[PDB]
């Protein structure tokens, strides 16, 4: 019933400043101290700052001290984290964890909000369809989402109704541009009998394209 | 910032185990079990212990560890309007010194008195005895025991004093014993805690050894099991009597001593992240356990007195000094190796009070050092100035009539004075400062918050537990009286203008600072309720 | 900073087996202050064990904790497939608060060979001057696989994006895509494109190829 939802956050340039937010609900927020833990893209958990249940006791980390500020609002149940003087190292998903008893750890974690700190520019993807080469039983198709920034994109097939046999790959960064691809296999009787569309969404750049797979 | 810290963690615990365990655990708790239906009395005593005593014991220990200062500075930093609570408590403890050490002397006088083949208090054919001298305790007032006449006629010479106005001659044999007490107190506290916290290793521990060898000697006496019956045979009729929950309540409060600025002082030299909640629970239990043990050491010898000496149990089941200076010695004078039971019995009584005087005086030294740095540097000088004054005016207590002046201090110096001061301690901490703000303090120290049980005992049960005692302390009030002597009216007024000489500084300082800061009227309260830690 | 190091970094395990994993502090930690979190892919962490050995709410009894001082251990009596996660220990006794380095628990599976597919550059792509030929390698085990690109029989090494999937939660297999990117002027002056996959299953490599003609 207790729930933490983090918010704000996205792309900033180095030296920039952002303020994240965690919306507490389902318990007496004012009775529990809270803390910001982050997770790099190398999947390494790191604690950032703790704030006592009334905000009178506040511990930072040596890597964010002087730049980050943690604060409470027990009136409206909101936990803030004001980040200034941002650096690329501060790129992580930021989690909001509830830990009032040191002998009990963080009993409830939120869901994350993502921060990218790059001087890179937001570009939309071009979405290429992959068809086979001009051949029996099961067939396999593809979709190529190349050269976008930042994360994330969403990729489905036939608006989400095709969920089995699909292998959509995590993005890889190369010279400040993400490339992603997805693989779907269907029976040789389902394609091109039916139609297979590739639905790609990149809200950071206001791109929502569909791409139908057709034979050559 | 970088203030001292207990050289060892045991030094702290023994200093607290020791401050809490004194003669009241021996000459007061077993009597209450005896009077109030035996084992059944443990019910209200535990309930009053668990909801009144341990809550207030934990509270002051926390405040001491957390605010890192003596009693004046500390209350001045929680609620500056109520800074006077600190001032009042240092006075109340200052007063108690004027009569508490004089009972340690009595223990040493009987110690230096038990260096003999035949203890002097056993026979009725001395120069100090009367034709109305029985060998053991009776129930007729004009006919006292050979040990009531030793105590009231040789040690004390109380017979030569018509009352409080008649102090008569200074007994220099006793005035020497009082100096030996303040000498022991000086060279245990002068160079600070690094030394103090070592002397408690003997003074807090030596009683446990004597308790053990007197427990064996007591339980192996013809009739010892009859005493234990008188001590613990349950009679729940009394649990339904209100005047029993008050005896429990009052023993619980005055035996643990929360609110006197001593646990505050002692805990202020703890490290910030010490598990003080476990230190409260451990230390407390050890106090109540030490009384339960002692009650067997008493009522064993009390049954042996009742079986092999022909005395009504009612007549030796006493409380207060009489029980340890008259009744129990007179039982030792019969058993073989009597000289040995005396010497360890009186050395036990002495080391039982020294622990407690240390902490009472350390609360004073700490509270002022943390507020008057002129005296924080000049320490060795300061304590000499305190004890010498204690000694000099303490010559008044070494007179023939001294006891009358002591019973007076015994009633007013720390009477309702400390009850009402601690009442404003519970209210300051729970309500004005804040339970929530206090728990957040405690969390930062030990890592978890105080359970809801503790927080309800802090804003509700504590001030009512105290109020419960203080009201009944006024319901059954009587004018001050000892034996047939009735203290004159001006003695009582003198006593009140001693109890008030400490409580008045609560509203006085609250009135002084309220008229010492600029701003609007409410604007003043808010500035005099903002803690020193919040303003930075 | 009390650096916590977890070992091993990756362990594979067949269901039913017994797994142990260690947490090693650079400075002693009080046993009531060392906790354990589980984290599954694409989700936030969950509190799993607090105070060395106490299980958190919802944690099956096949998990235990032991250790003290500077060495601690999480242990699973008999593993199940819903335990494939990454385990982090945490220290709460001093500041800064520190998380371990992670142990990754993966499911062991019967060795399986991959299914290779070629995809010549999309026409929409070729319009802009670009040519990306992609290769898929689907549903295989174990995780290590090596790939080789040949253009008219000569090996091409630069300009290749490789991506791996997390272990599939159904058949416990892996999959990888390699994506060669060359210019359009480059793709149109060669004929044969080849995608060779060396895997532990076969001695010789699986080949998939095509000609820019058909
Ligand atoms: C030899 C005889 C006199 C026994 C000496 C100790 C006892 C008189 C007992 C009786 C009731 C006991 C108490 C009963 C219940 C409580 C509340 C209890 O509260 C909790 O467990 C909540 C813990 C939390 O909220 O963090 C802690 C111990 C305590 C004070 C106990 C301390 C020991 C007490 C005072
Ligand atoms: C029957 C009677 C005589 C038994 C006497 C009980 C004695 C043995 C008990 C009661 C109180 C105890 C002490 C209380 C406090 C502690 C703190 C702990 O960190 C170390 C031991 C130490 C210092 C204990 C030593 C043993 C002790 C002195
Ligand atoms: O019980 C609530 C919460 O805090 C607990 O506090 C313990 C403390 O840690 C022990 O040392 C001892 O004092 O008992 C206390 C009971 O409150 C526990 O620490 C913790 O596990 C528990 O969740
Ligand atoms: O011990 C101090 C004490 O010594 C003498 O008292 C003795 C007394 O002299 C002896 O007769 C002995 O048997 O009884 C007392 C000791 O128990 C001094 O007379 C006395 O002034 C002094 O305080
Ligand atoms: C001298 C010992 N002190 C320090 C002032 C006390 O407070 C005690 C005390 C003494 C007389 C009256 C009430 C209470 C012994 C309690 C606590 N154990
Ligand atoms: C300098 C402080 C001394 C205070 C002594 C007050 C005595 C009051 C007794 C009526
Ligand atoms: Cl008691
Ligand atoms: Na006591
Ligand atoms: Na004592």
């Amino acid at each position: 019933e207790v729930q933490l939802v983090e918010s704000g956050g996205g792309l900033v340039k180095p030296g920039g400043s952002l303020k994240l937010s965690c919306a507490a609900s389902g318990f007496t927020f004012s009775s529990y101290a809270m803390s910001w833990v982050r997770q790099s893209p190398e999947k390494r958990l790191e604690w950032v700052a703790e704030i006592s249940s009334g905000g009178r006791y506040i511990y930072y980390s040596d890597t964010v001290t002087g730049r980050f500020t943690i604060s409470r609002d027990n009136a409206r149940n909101i936990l803030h984290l004001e980040m200034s003087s941002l650096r690329s190292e501060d790129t992580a998903m930021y989690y909001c964890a509830r830990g009032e008893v040191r002998q009990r750890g963080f009993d409830y974690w939120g869901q994350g909000t993502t921060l990218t700190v790059s001087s890179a520019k937001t570009t939309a993807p071009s979405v290429y369809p992959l068809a086979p080469v001009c051949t029996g039983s099961s067939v396999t198709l593809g979709c190529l989402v190349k050269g976008y920034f930042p994360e994330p994109v969403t990729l489905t097939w036939n608006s989400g109704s095709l969920s089995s046999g699909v292998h959509t790959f995590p993005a890889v960064l190369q010279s400040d541009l993400y490339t992603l691809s997805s693989s779907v296999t269907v029976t040789s009787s389902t394609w091109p009998s039916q139609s297979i569309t590739c639905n790609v969404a990149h809200p950071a750049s206001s791109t929502k394209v569909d791409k139908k797979i057709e034979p050559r | 910032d970088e203030r001292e810290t207990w050289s060892g963690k045991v030094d702290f615990l023994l200093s607290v185990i020791g401050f809490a365990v004194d003669l009241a655990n021996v000459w007061r708790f077993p009597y209450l079990c005896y009077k109030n239906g035996g084992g059944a009395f443990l019910v209200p005593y535990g309930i009053m212990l668990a909801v009144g005593g341990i809550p207030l014991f934990y509270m002051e220990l926390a405040l001491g560890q957390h605010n890192r200062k003596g009693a004046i500075t500390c209350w001045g930093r929680l609620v500056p309007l109520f800074k006077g609570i600190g001032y009042a408590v240092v006075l109340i403890a200052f007063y108690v010194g004027f009569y508490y050490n004089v009972i340690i002397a009595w223990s040493l006088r009987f110690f230096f008195a038990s260096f003999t083949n035949s203890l002097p208090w056993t026979s009725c054919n001395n120069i100090w005895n009367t034709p109305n001298c029985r060998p053991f305790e009776g129930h007729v007032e004009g006919f006292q025991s050979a040990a009531s006449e030793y105590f009231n006629r040789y040690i004390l010479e109380l017979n030569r004093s018509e009352g409080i106005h008649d102090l008569g001659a200074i007994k220099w044999d006793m005035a020497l014993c009082l100096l030996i007490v303040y000498l022991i107190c000086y060279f245990s506290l002068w160079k600070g805690i690094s030394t103090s916290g070592k002397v408690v290793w003997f003074t807090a521990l030596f009683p446990y050894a004597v308790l053990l060898i007197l427990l064996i000697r007591g339980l192996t006496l013809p009739g010892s099991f009859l005493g234990i019956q008188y001590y613990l045979t349950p009679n729940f009729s009394a649990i339904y009597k209100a005047e029993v929950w008050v005896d429990a309540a009052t023993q619980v409060f005055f035996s643990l001593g929360p609110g006197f600025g001593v646990l505050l002082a002692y805990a202020s030299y703890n490290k910030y992240h010490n598990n003080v909640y476990k230190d409260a629970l451990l230390t407390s239990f050890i106090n109540s356990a030490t009384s339960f043990i002692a009650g067997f050491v008493i009522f064993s010898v009390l049954g042996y007195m009742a079986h092999t000496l022909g005395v009504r149990i009612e007549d030796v089941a006493t409380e207060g000094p009489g029980l340890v200076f008259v009744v129990y010695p007179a039982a030792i004078a019969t058993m073989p190796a009597s000289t040995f039971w005396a010497l360890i019995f009186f050395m036990m009584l002495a080391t039982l009070g020294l622990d407690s005087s240390f902490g009472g005086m350390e609360a004073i030294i700490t509270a002022l050092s943390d507020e008057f740095p002129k005296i924080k540097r000049n320490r060795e000088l300061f304590v000499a100035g305190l004890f010498s004054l204690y000694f000099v005016v303490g010559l008044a207590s070494c007179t023939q009539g001294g006891f009358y002046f002591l019973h007076l201090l015994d009633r007013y110096a720390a009477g309702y004075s400390i009850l009402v001061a601690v009442f404003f301690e519970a209210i300051a901490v729970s309500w004005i400062y804040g339970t929530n703000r206090f728990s957040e303090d405690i969390r930062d120290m030990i890592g978890f918050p105080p359970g809801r049980y503790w927080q309800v005992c802090w804003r509700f049960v504590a001030p009512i537990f105290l109020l419960f005692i203080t009201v009944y302390g006024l319901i059954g009030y009587e004018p001050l009286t000892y034996a047939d002597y009735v203290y004159p009216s001006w003695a009582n007024a003198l006593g009140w203008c001693i109890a008030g000489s400490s409580v008045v500084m609560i509203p006085a300082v609250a009135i002084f600072k309220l008229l010492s800061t600029p701003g609007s009227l409410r604007q003043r309260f808010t500035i005099l309720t903002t803690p020193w830690r919040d303003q930075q | 900073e009390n650096v916590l190091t977890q070992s091993p970094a990756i362990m594979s395990t067949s269901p039913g087996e017994k797994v142990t994993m260690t947490c090693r502090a650079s400075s002693s930690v009080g046993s009531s202050y060392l906790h354990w979190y589980q984290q599954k892919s694409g989700a936030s962490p969950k509190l799993w064990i607090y105070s060395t050995s106490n299980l958190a709410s919802g944690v099956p009894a096949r998990f235990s904790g032991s250790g003290s001082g500077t060495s601690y251990s999480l242990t699973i009596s008999s593993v199940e497939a819903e335990d494939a996660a990454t385990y982090y220990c945490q220290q709460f006794s001093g500041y800064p608060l520190t998380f371990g380095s992670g142990t990754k628990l993966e499911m062991k599976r019967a060795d399986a060979a991959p299914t290779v597919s070629i995809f010549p550059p999309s026409s929409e792509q070729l319009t802009s001057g670009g040519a990306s030929v992609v290769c898929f390698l689907n549903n295989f085990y174990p995780k290590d696989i090596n790939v080789k690109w040949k253009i008219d029989g000569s090996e091409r090494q630069n300009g290749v994006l490789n991506s791996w999937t997390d272990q599939d939660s159904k058949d416990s297999t892996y999959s990888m895509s390699s994506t060669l990117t060359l210019t359009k002027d480059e793709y149109e002056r060669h004929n044969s494109y080849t995608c060779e996959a060396t895997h532990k299953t076969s001695t010789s490599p699986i080949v998939k190829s095509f000609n820019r003609n058909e």
Side-chain angles (χ1 to χ4, degrees), chain A residues 39 43 47 50 59 102-106 110 128-129 131 134 140 146 167 169-170 174 181-183 211 216, chain C residues 32-33 35 37 39 44 47 50-51 88 95 97 119-120 122 124 136 138-139 161 163-164 175 177 181 214:
Chain A
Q39 204 183 219
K43 291 295 176 69
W47 173 84
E50 196 200 7
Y59 300 104
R102 286 198 257 254
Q103 294 82 352
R104 287 250 328 169
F106 299 115
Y128 307 133
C134 315
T140 301
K146 187 180 193 302
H167 273 296
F169 296 85
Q174 283 186 5
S181 55
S182 177
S183 148
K211 207 81 183 196
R216 353 195 152 203
Chain C
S32 47
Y33 282 135
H35 320 309
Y37 306 93
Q39 195 183 225
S44 39
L47 176 73
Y50 67 87
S51 278
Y88 300 92
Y95 292 79
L97 278 39
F119 296 96
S122 169
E124 304 82 326
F136 285 145
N138 285 12
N139 294 102
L161 191 145
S163 180
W164 260 277
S175 301
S177 99
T181 298
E214 291 80 310

Side-chain angles (χ1 to χ4, degrees), chain C residues 1-2 5-6 39 62 71 73 84 95-96 148-149 167 170 180-182 184 208 210 214:
Chain C
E1 193 186 61
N2 191 344
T5 296
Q6 311 187 196
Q39 195 183 225
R62 47 182 140 92
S71 178
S73 62
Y95 292 79
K148 188 179 289 188
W149 278 101
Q167 196 173 41
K170 305 144 211 61
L180 192 183
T181 298
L182 40 73
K184 191 235 286 184
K208 283 278 176 176
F210 82 100
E214 291 80 310

